[PDB]
Design an enzyme around this catalytic site. Structure first.
Site: not given
Ligand SMILES: [Cl-]
Ligand SMILES: [Cl-]
Ligand SMILES: [Cl-]
Ligand SMILES: [Cl-]
Lengths: 597, 597
Positions: B172, B412, B468, B503
């Protein structure tokens, strides 16, 4: 036939808007016949308004199914000497109307008016008016709701089971429902009254000929008179029956941004009605869109009826603000994306000289974003019958507006797939048959890889394209956006017919900035538009630019909707982003007529 | 061996940071050997800094390939009596270093230090220092760049051909490159000097035993002394050779938010070096994470090294601001997502008592978001060799930090697919072999449907989950988020080992608000967190919560990135959103130790 209700020497007009009782259906409201009694344990809701945003409740905003509105209706018995009519300007999406527990009418279609007489015998000394309102959408409604189809804009990375059953919009804008527009009681004489008025005009030298057809009920004598704004009679014919014509010497034409409305006064028996009317011509000739025989260039927007907190509800101060901003910006036009707008807005556009592309409710007619236009038996879309009714009702309501120059039959339907022509040809034929003025017809074209297979090419007088070069493709690569834009638009330009943008834009959060091209910033919105105009300004058949959107508006929730759709030139509270100032400068330098002559 | 460079009685320290010459490679910089001469027609660039955001040029920000930095290096010839070393704290991603047109060293890996001696014979009266910096990423780099794989987060609705070749991040955060951290010249005695220092501690009653290994070059005598902050000697051993031990009576332990650092002073021949050192124990026992034999509860964040306009560049005022905000908020910890952070930050965390999960550069090790961990011959990821080097170098740099309590091997990765265990087992074995303190190891787990197949279960001491619920799934349905959260986390809780969130969060644009649950608003961020804590607070093996993210940060462009990643509790300029105040209240009421005892 749906003449706008007005106060006249023969017609009372009683607005029933105000604070009404309101109750969510819990699954028992029809079984327990809530309409037979005062609603119990109810909330209060302003009418007109969408109900979704008035409170602070997600269960209310995201309700699935019916709600019940109600008010008392205590009227003088002496009105019973008149014909008594209840007019619902709009109830979104479907309505059941009860007076005292008698079902008086039902209506499908959330954005067009309907009415019912109140039978004298039903009117007691005290009465209850109950309106049940259905918000559910599916493959048979316009706008279309998904059934088994996937959520493209609001899809999750990982599937989940929703807590409660909910509508599945096949469209971006939020599914605002409720009593969207005013409810009014009006009266006419009982025995003889005017039901409809149809006017067309022809310009012979400086003399306008107005052809009229006055539809009536009962036996009486018909008369018509045309008056200047200041009140001078310029034409009059008595005992004319239904059809006739008349002429206006040295007629003042209605022009974009230079409106002129005559007053057409009609009498039938004891009935009196006055219609404002602008005289103008519309024709497509070659690659030109001719208003009063001059080559128009559309400058404007797709809009929504969207304000806070009423949602879709009629907001007359904001309508006036919005037109003022349009004139401030140098725009001349907008499209009623994606449903007919209020009569109050349409009559104001006639008064102010704003040109309108009048669009049906037919958004979401697309099952592959089983074929969309497969036979209903094989699972195809089930909207064509209601689609025909919407076209009939829209043209019946709006046929006399000078501001309406073109009909949009659908927005972003599956027009590149098999069966689309077969679905749409009867609808285009219907619009051309029913519009007395034979105005241009279009459909608004979804962006698609096989754009040369869009059946719009076989049906439309003007090609109306929704294109997002630099947003949904080529995001943050505006050089590639320019090249891809030019390649496709040179195809459309080669067909020799007028075409235009009805949508193009970039989501933009007010207050986000970067000197260096960055999606969602105010600067990128400007650069996106500069890049597109580099191409469109060189194409002689490109006759108009309408941005998506006039203003930020509410949508369903999902990962690509930053609290709604942010492609407005203005915020939801009508504040100008950088690109609003860009377009004010750009449109200040482009004439309404003769830009591409 | 990479001791942090410091000024000592035997070691000069000369910072070469400042304004350097800078030139984009145009495809001819190596062919024309730009490093042999002053850079011509060059720009100026601050060092240390990422180069991408300093100017206003998209071609610079989005550059693909090499750039050349250069400065003059005029130093006294009398330094030639010493060993002269050039230390690069970080050059992102790959570096070629030239002195006067002689290539002195090359380095792969953008976030860990490297150094080279300058041969005396190369040092002329006037010298040029040139650093070529490569920004390219692919299947062999950490972080990973895509080659033929599709853009999931930044995908278009319609494919397009990019104007220019660009990196394809498989991560990201924005691909900030350049001379990220300081460049310094330092000296040591030529004939005998300290190369590395290794310290471990054991607590016997109130007596700490510190075991040391002092790695040296040359023949001399080694001595070690441990001093309180105020300067009292508490242990000393002379002529100890390489390995030894010593004891501190009534030792002051380093604790989260209550730091204590001794000064460990070492002499070897004429060389002098001082290392700060905190005494503390770390152990996983059952479902407990024990710091100094007490059950810790992590409260904090995944961070980024991200500020404007330096990008990833060392920003010492902001490092101090960030720690101050952490203490203001009641946090005790963070993770170095997704690369080793600067030594200056790590040493400051030791001084301030902030606990750190120290993570490698191994993000993007995932080709199916051909199997990821297929043999290299069949197209599998090509990172394992460099992954081993990164682990070696990270532990070599950071082994002596009291603040580092756990190593994160990867973020991840494709750990639910075949071959993942075979890829990771040698890396976990390596980390356990090389860390003298044998601290816990984990990998940070991607959210996945087959979570019971995550090879973390077979490898990690603590399960570290990125989840999430209420954002990437169940968006705007927090009741469904709570149910889905509980179902999965009860599985992890049933394994009896410590687990935590590394996260969890929701994109939130400061200034967007709604009383009624709406994605991207400040209120929804709070409700998202309340919903998750409803579950985690009931699970006794859940031993920590680190949000994504401490602050908004820059990313690649695309339809779901509203000018970067907006999941910060703080804005990019470190201003608190509503949820920052929520967590200040929540963490104020949760102890660092004994929350779940
Ligand atoms: Cl990131
Ligand atoms: Cl995110
Ligand atoms: Cl829409
Ligand atoms: Cl859009």
């Amino acid at each position: 036939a749906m003449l706008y209700p007005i106060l006249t020497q023969s017609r009372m007009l009683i607005d029933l808007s105000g604070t009404w009782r309101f109750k969510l259906d819990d699954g028992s409201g029809f079984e327990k016949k809530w309409y037979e009694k005062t609603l119990d344990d109810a909330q209060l809701m302003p009418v007109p308004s969408s109900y979704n945003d008035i409170k602070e409740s997600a269960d209310l905003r995201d309700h699935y199914g019916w709600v019940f509105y109600q008010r008392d209706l205590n009227i003088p018995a002496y009105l019973k000497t008149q014909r008594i009519v209840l007019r619902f300007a709009a109830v979104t999406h479907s309505a059941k109307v009860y007076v005292n527990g008698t079902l008086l009418c039902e209506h499908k279609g959330g954005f067009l008016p309907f009415e019912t007489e109140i039978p004298e015998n039903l009117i007691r000394d005290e009465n209850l008016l109950t309106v049940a309102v259905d918000n559910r959408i599916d493959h048979s409604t316009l706008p279309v709701g998904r059934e088994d189809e996937s959520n493209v804009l609001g899809g999750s990375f990982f599937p989940y089971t929703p807590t409660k059953k909910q509508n599945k919009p096949n469209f971006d804008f939020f599914n605002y429902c409720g009593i969207t527009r005013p409810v009014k009681l009006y009266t006419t004489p009982k025995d003889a009254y005017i039901s409809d008025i149809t006017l067309t005009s022809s310009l012979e030298n400086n003399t306008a000929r107005i052809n009229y057809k006055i539809d009536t009920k009962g036996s009486a004598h018909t008369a018509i008179g045309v008056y200047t704004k200041q009140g001078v009679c310029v034409a009059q014919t008595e005992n004319t029956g239904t059809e006739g014509s008349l002429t206006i010497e040295n007629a003042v034409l209605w022009e974009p941004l230079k409106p002129y409305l005559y007053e057409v006064k009609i009498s039938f028996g004891e009935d009196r009605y006055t219609l404002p009317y602008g005289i103008r011509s519309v024709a497509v000739k070659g690659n030109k869109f001719l208003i009063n025989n001059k080559p128009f260039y559309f400058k404007g927007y797709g809009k929504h009826e969207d304000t806070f907190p009423a949602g879709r509800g009629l907001n007359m101060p904001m309508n006036a603000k919005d037109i003022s901003l349009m004139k401030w910006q140098g725009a001349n036009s907008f499209r009623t994306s994606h449903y007919p707008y209020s009569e109050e807005m349409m009559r104001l556009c006639d008064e102010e000289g704003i040109v309108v592309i009048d669009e049906t409710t037919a958004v979401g007619v697309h099952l592959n974003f089983v074929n969309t236009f497969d036979p209903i038996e094989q699972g195809g879309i089930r909207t064509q019958s209601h689609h025909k009714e919407v076209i009939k009702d829209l043209i019946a309501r709006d046929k006399n507006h000078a501001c309406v120059v073109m009909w949009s039959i659908a927005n972003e339907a599956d027009t590149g797939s098999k069966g689309a022509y077969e679905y749409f040809k009867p609808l285009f034929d219907l619009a051309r048959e029913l519009d007395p003025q034979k105005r241009p017809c279009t459909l608004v074209s979804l962006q698609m890889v096989n754009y040369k297979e869009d059946c719009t090419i076989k049906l439309s007088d003007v090609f109306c394209l929704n294109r997002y070069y630099g947003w949904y493709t080529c995001g943050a690569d505006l050089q590639a956006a320019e090249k891809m834009c030019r390649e496709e638009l040179e195809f459309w330009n080669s067909l020799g017919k007028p075409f235009m943008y009805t949508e193009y834009g970039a989501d933009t959060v007010m207050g986000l900035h970067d000197t260096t091209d960055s999606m969602f910033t105010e600067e990128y919105q400007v650069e996106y538009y500069k890049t597109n105009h580099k191409v469109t300004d060189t194409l002689d058949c490109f006759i108009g630019e309408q941005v998506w959107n006039f203003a930020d508006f509410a949508t369903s929730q999902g990962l690509i909707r930053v609290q709604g759709n942010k492609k407005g030139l203005f915020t939801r509270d009508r504040k100008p982003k950088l690109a609003a100032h860009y377009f004010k400068e750009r449109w200040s330098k482009i004439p309404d007529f003769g830009y591409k002559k």
